[PDB]
Design a protein around this ligand. Structure first.
Ligand SMILES: CC1=C(/C=C/C(C)=C/C=C\C(C)=C/C(=O)O)C(C)(C)CCC1
Ligand SMILES: CC1=C(/C=C/C(C)=C/C=C\C(C)=C/C(=O)O)C(C)(C)CCC1
Lengths: 127, 127
Protein backbone atom coordinates (compact mmCIF):
# COMPACT_ATOMS: atom_id res chain seq x y z
CA UNK A 1 0.00 0.00 0.00
CA UNK A 2 1.36 3.25 -1.70
CA UNK A 3 2.16 6.50 0.21
CA UNK A 4 0.92 10.11 0.02
CA UNK A 5 -2.01 11.71 -1.94
CA UNK A 6 -3.06 8.83 -4.45
CA UNK A 7 -4.99 5.50 -3.97
CA UNK A 8 -3.72 2.54 -1.85
CA UNK A 9 -6.58 0.00 -1.66
CA UNK A 10 -8.58 3.21 -1.49
CA UNK A 11 -9.08 3.87 2.14
CA UNK A 12 -11.60 6.79 1.61
CA UNK A 13 -14.22 6.74 -1.19
CA UNK A 14 -17.25 9.00 -1.50
CA UNK A 15 -20.33 8.15 -3.54
CA UNK A 16 -23.06 10.64 -4.21
CA UNK A 17 -26.55 10.01 -5.58
CA UNK A 18 -29.37 12.17 -6.84
CA UNK A 19 -32.90 11.29 -5.54
CA UNK A 20 -34.70 13.65 -7.92
CA UNK A 21 -33.28 12.29 -11.21
CA UNK A 22 -32.51 8.72 -10.10
CA UNK A 23 -28.84 8.94 -11.09
CA UNK A 24 -25.38 9.42 -9.73
CA UNK A 25 -24.65 13.10 -8.83
CA UNK A 26 -21.84 13.97 -11.26
CA UNK A 27 -19.19 16.62 -10.91
CA UNK A 28 -19.95 17.43 -7.21
CA UNK A 29 -16.97 19.05 -5.48
CA UNK A 30 -15.73 17.37 -2.39
CA UNK A 31 -13.21 18.75 0.11
CA UNK A 32 -11.67 16.81 2.92
CA UNK A 33 -9.94 18.25 5.99
CA UNK A 34 -8.12 16.82 9.04
CA UNK A 35 -8.35 18.32 12.43
CA UNK A 36 -4.91 19.64 13.37
CA UNK A 37 -2.83 19.69 16.55
CA UNK A 38 -4.06 23.16 17.20
CA UNK A 39 -7.77 22.36 16.99
CA UNK A 40 -8.30 23.73 13.49
CA UNK A 41 -9.12 22.22 10.16
CA UNK A 42 -6.38 21.76 7.77
CA UNK A 43 -7.05 21.02 4.05
CA UNK A 44 -6.35 17.31 3.37
CA UNK A 45 -7.63 16.36 -0.12
CA UNK A 46 -10.18 17.39 -2.70
CA UNK A 47 -11.89 16.33 -5.85
CA UNK A 48 -14.97 15.98 -8.00
CA UNK A 49 -17.20 13.07 -8.35
CA UNK A 50 -17.15 11.16 -11.65
CA UNK A 51 -19.78 10.03 -14.14
CA UNK A 52 -20.73 7.22 -11.76
CA UNK A 53 -21.05 9.61 -8.80
CA UNK A 54 -17.81 8.37 -7.06
CA UNK A 55 -14.56 9.87 -5.95
CA UNK A 56 -11.59 7.53 -5.24
CA UNK A 57 -7.92 8.33 -4.87
CA UNK A 58 -8.25 11.01 -2.28
CA UNK A 59 -5.43 9.53 -0.10
CA UNK A 60 -3.18 6.58 0.60
CA UNK A 61 -3.07 4.24 3.46
CA UNK A 62 0.23 5.72 4.49
CA UNK A 63 -1.07 9.37 4.63
CA UNK A 64 -4.48 8.53 6.27
CA UNK A 65 -3.44 8.49 9.86
CA UNK A 66 -5.63 8.46 12.87
CA UNK A 67 -7.48 11.69 13.38
CA UNK A 68 -10.72 13.52 13.07
CA UNK A 69 -11.68 14.18 9.46
CA UNK A 70 -14.33 16.31 7.82
CA UNK A 71 -15.70 15.54 4.31
CA UNK A 72 -17.61 18.57 2.89
CA UNK A 73 -19.91 18.08 -0.18
CA UNK A 74 -20.77 21.04 -2.17
CA UNK A 75 -24.36 20.27 -2.68
CA UNK A 76 -25.49 23.82 -3.27
CA UNK A 77 -23.54 24.42 -6.47
CA UNK A 78 -24.79 20.99 -7.66
CA UNK A 79 -28.50 21.91 -7.38
CA UNK A 80 -27.99 25.48 -8.52
CA UNK A 81 -26.49 24.35 -11.76
CA UNK A 82 -29.73 22.31 -12.34
CA UNK A 83 -31.65 25.45 -11.55
CA UNK A 84 -32.96 24.64 -8.09
CA UNK A 85 -32.32 26.70 -5.11
CA UNK A 86 -31.76 24.13 -2.41
CA UNK A 87 -31.99 24.45 1.37
CA UNK A 88 -28.55 23.50 2.63
CA UNK A 89 -25.26 25.27 2.14
CA UNK A 90 -23.42 21.92 1.87
CA UNK A 91 -23.54 18.54 3.52
CA UNK A 92 -20.68 17.68 5.97
CA UNK A 93 -19.64 14.29 7.46
CA UNK A 94 -17.27 14.52 10.56
CA UNK A 95 -15.79 11.37 12.02
CA UNK A 96 -12.85 9.78 13.78
CA UNK A 97 -10.85 7.46 11.57
CA UNK A 98 -8.46 4.60 12.05
CA UNK A 99 -8.45 4.78 15.77
CA UNK A 100 -8.34 0.99 16.20
CA UNK A 101 -6.26 0.42 13.20
CA UNK A 102 -6.64 1.24 9.57
CA UNK A 103 -9.99 0.69 7.95
CA UNK A 104 -11.55 1.44 4.53
CA UNK A 105 -14.33 3.90 4.62
CA UNK A 106 -17.03 4.51 2.03
CA UNK A 107 -19.09 7.63 2.64
CA UNK A 108 -22.36 7.71 0.69
CA UNK A 109 -24.75 10.66 0.34
CA UNK A 110 -28.29 10.67 -1.27
CA UNK A 111 -29.38 14.19 -2.18
CA UNK A 112 -32.73 16.01 -2.53
CA UNK A 113 -33.16 19.74 -2.47
CA UNK A 114 -34.47 19.99 1.01
CA UNK A 115 -33.10 16.80 2.37
CA UNK A 116 -29.93 14.67 2.53
CA UNK A 117 -29.05 11.47 3.90
CA UNK A 118 -25.63 10.11 4.57
CA UNK A 119 -24.34 6.59 5.53
CA UNK A 120 -20.88 5.11 6.07
CA UNK A 121 -19.73 1.61 5.30
CA UNK A 122 -16.52 0.66 7.15
CA UNK A 123 -14.56 -2.55 6.27
CA UNK A 124 -11.53 -4.04 7.87
CA UNK A 125 -8.81 -4.35 5.14
CA UNK A 126 -6.64 -7.30 4.06
CA UNK A 127 -6.26 -8.49 0.46
CA UNK B 1 -40.54 20.78 27.60
CA UNK B 2 -37.40 23.00 27.05
CA UNK B 3 -36.12 26.13 25.27
CA UNK B 4 -33.17 28.45 24.27
CA UNK B 5 -32.55 32.08 23.65
CA UNK B 6 -36.14 33.11 24.53
CA UNK B 7 -39.70 32.12 23.36
CA UNK B 8 -41.87 33.85 20.61
CA UNK B 9 -43.77 32.56 17.53
CA UNK B 10 -41.20 29.83 17.05
CA UNK B 11 -39.39 30.62 13.90
CA UNK B 12 -37.03 27.62 14.23
CA UNK B 13 -37.75 24.16 15.66
CA UNK B 14 -35.64 21.00 15.65
CA UNK B 15 -37.06 17.47 15.97
CA UNK B 16 -34.78 14.38 16.39
CA UNK B 17 -35.82 10.79 15.94
CA UNK B 18 -34.16 7.44 16.75
CA UNK B 19 -34.33 4.78 13.93
CA UNK B 20 -32.92 2.04 16.04
CA UNK B 21 -35.57 2.22 18.74
CA UNK B 22 -38.51 3.81 16.88
CA UNK B 23 -38.63 6.70 19.33
CA UNK B 24 -37.91 10.34 19.78
CA UNK B 25 -34.28 11.09 20.59
CA UNK B 26 -34.60 12.71 24.06
CA UNK B 27 -32.06 14.81 25.86
CA UNK B 28 -29.95 15.40 22.81
CA UNK B 29 -27.86 18.61 22.86
CA UNK B 30 -28.42 21.03 20.08
CA UNK B 31 -26.35 24.15 19.49
CA UNK B 32 -27.14 26.78 16.95
CA UNK B 33 -24.80 29.32 15.57
CA UNK B 34 -24.90 32.33 13.29
CA UNK B 35 -22.15 33.06 10.84
CA UNK B 36 -20.26 36.33 11.63
CA UNK B 37 -18.64 39.06 9.40
CA UNK B 38 -15.29 37.55 10.14
CA UNK B 39 -16.82 34.27 8.95
CA UNK B 40 -16.57 32.53 12.18
CA UNK B 41 -19.40 31.04 13.95
CA UNK B 42 -20.97 32.70 16.88
CA UNK B 43 -23.14 30.98 19.44
CA UNK B 44 -26.77 31.96 19.08
CA UNK B 45 -28.98 29.50 21.01
CA UNK B 46 -28.75 25.92 22.43
CA UNK B 47 -30.81 23.43 24.37
CA UNK B 48 -31.62 19.79 24.82
CA UNK B 49 -34.53 17.96 23.10
CA UNK B 50 -37.50 17.06 25.22
CA UNK B 51 -39.49 13.84 25.69
CA UNK B 52 -41.06 14.13 22.31
CA UNK B 53 -37.72 14.75 20.76
CA UNK B 54 -38.45 18.52 20.02
CA UNK B 55 -36.54 21.67 20.82
CA UNK B 56 -38.58 24.94 20.63
CA UNK B 57 -38.14 28.49 21.94
CA UNK B 58 -34.67 28.66 20.49
CA UNK B 59 -35.22 32.13 19.05
CA UNK B 60 -37.84 34.66 18.20
CA UNK B 61 -38.72 36.46 15.10
CA UNK B 62 -37.06 39.75 15.86
CA UNK B 63 -33.64 38.14 16.43
CA UNK B 64 -33.92 35.54 13.63
CA UNK B 65 -32.81 37.68 10.79
CA UNK B 66 -31.35 36.68 7.45
CA UNK B 67 -27.98 34.98 7.46
CA UNK B 68 -26.38 31.66 7.50
CA UNK B 69 -27.05 29.44 10.40
CA UNK B 70 -25.61 26.21 11.66
CA UNK B 71 -27.41 23.71 13.71
CA UNK B 72 -25.03 21.16 15.39
CA UNK B 73 -26.58 17.95 16.97
CA UNK B 74 -24.55 16.05 19.44
CA UNK B 75 -25.32 12.67 18.14
CA UNK B 76 -22.27 11.01 19.54
CA UNK B 77 -23.14 11.60 23.15
CA UNK B 78 -26.57 10.27 22.38
CA UNK B 79 -25.39 6.85 21.13
CA UNK B 80 -22.73 6.49 23.80
CA UNK B 81 -25.43 6.89 26.41
CA UNK B 82 -27.09 3.91 24.78
CA UNK B 83 -23.98 1.86 24.70
CA UNK B 84 -23.57 2.03 20.93
CA UNK B 85 -20.35 3.03 19.16
CA UNK B 86 -21.36 5.69 16.65
CA UNK B 87 -19.69 6.77 13.42
CA UNK B 88 -20.19 10.54 13.34
CA UNK B 89 -18.72 13.07 15.74
CA UNK B 90 -22.02 15.16 15.44
CA UNK B 91 -24.62 16.10 12.79
CA UNK B 92 -24.44 19.61 11.33
CA UNK B 93 -27.03 21.39 9.14
CA UNK B 94 -25.95 24.64 7.53
CA UNK B 95 -28.49 26.73 5.71
CA UNK B 96 -29.34 30.29 4.78
CA UNK B 97 -32.41 31.89 6.33
CA UNK B 98 -34.19 34.32 3.86
CA UNK B 99 -37.04 36.74 4.40
CA UNK B 100 -38.45 36.46 0.94
CA UNK B 101 -39.53 32.89 1.49
CA UNK B 102 -41.47 31.33 4.27
CA UNK B 103 -40.90 31.98 7.85
CA UNK B 104 -41.26 28.76 9.92
CA UNK B 105 -38.36 26.38 9.69
CA UNK B 106 -38.53 22.77 11.05
CA UNK B 107 -35.24 20.93 10.87
CA UNK B 108 -35.73 17.26 11.42
CA UNK B 109 -33.12 14.58 11.89
CA UNK B 110 -33.46 10.74 11.92
CA UNK B 111 -30.49 9.02 13.48
CA UNK B 112 -28.86 5.58 13.17
CA UNK B 113 -25.34 4.73 14.49
CA UNK B 114 -23.76 4.86 10.95
CA UNK B 115 -26.18 6.99 9.21
CA UNK B 116 -28.27 10.14 9.57
CA UNK B 117 -30.80 11.83 7.47
CA UNK B 118 -31.97 15.45 7.69
CA UNK B 119 -34.89 17.30 6.11
CA UNK B 120 -36.20 20.70 6.35
CA UNK B 121 -39.90 21.69 6.20
CA UNK B 122 -40.32 25.39 5.49
CA UNK B 123 -43.84 26.79 5.84
CA UNK B 124 -46.04 29.83 6.26
CA UNK B 125 -48.29 28.37 8.92
CA UNK B 126 -47.08 26.67 12.13
CA UNK B 127 -44.82 23.67 12.93
C1 LIG C 1 -29.66 3.74 0.44
C2 LIG C 1 -28.95 4.98 0.98
C3 LIG C 1 -27.63 5.36 0.75
C4 LIG C 1 -26.61 4.45 0.15
C5 LIG C 1 -26.40 4.06 -1.27
C6 LIG C 1 -25.47 3.16 -1.89
C7 LIG C 1 -24.49 2.39 -0.98
C8 LIG C 1 -25.59 3.01 -3.24
C9 LIG C 1 -24.82 2.15 -4.10
C10 LIG C 1 -25.11 1.98 -5.42
C11 LIG C 1 -26.26 2.58 -6.09
C12 LIG C 1 -27.35 3.28 -5.20
C13 LIG C 1 -26.45 2.33 -7.41
C14 LIG C 1 -25.56 2.89 -8.43
O1 LIG C 1 -24.40 3.62 -8.60
O2 LIG C 1 -25.77 2.72 -9.82
C15 LIG C 1 -27.05 6.77 1.25
C16 LIG C 1 -25.76 6.59 2.09
C17 LIG C 1 -26.73 7.67 0.05
C18 LIG C 1 -28.08 7.47 2.14
C19 LIG C 1 -29.45 7.32 1.73
C20 LIG C 1 -29.91 5.87 1.74
C1 LIG D 1 -36.26 13.20 9.36
C2 LIG D 1 -36.92 11.89 8.93
C3 LIG D 1 -38.20 11.46 9.26
C4 LIG D 1 -39.04 12.08 10.34
C5 LIG D 1 -39.83 13.34 10.31
C6 LIG D 1 -40.60 14.01 11.31
C7 LIG D 1 -40.64 13.38 12.72
C8 LIG D 1 -41.18 15.18 10.94
C9 LIG D 1 -41.98 16.07 11.76
C10 LIG D 1 -42.40 17.29 11.32
C11 LIG D 1 -42.04 17.87 10.03
C12 LIG D 1 -40.94 17.14 9.18
C13 LIG D 1 -42.52 19.09 9.71
C14 LIG D 1 -43.93 19.31 9.43
O1 LIG D 1 -44.89 19.65 10.43
O2 LIG D 1 -44.88 19.31 8.41
C15 LIG D 1 -38.84 10.12 8.62
C16 LIG D 1 -39.35 9.15 9.71
C17 LIG D 1 -40.02 10.49 7.71
C18 LIG D 1 -37.77 9.39 7.80
C19 LIG D 1 -36.87 10.23 7.06
C20 LIG D 1 -36.05 11.14 7.96
Amino acid sequence: GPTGTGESKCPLMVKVLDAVRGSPAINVAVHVFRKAADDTWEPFASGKTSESGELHGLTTEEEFVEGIYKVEIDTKSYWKALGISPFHEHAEVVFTANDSGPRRYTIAALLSPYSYSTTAVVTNPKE
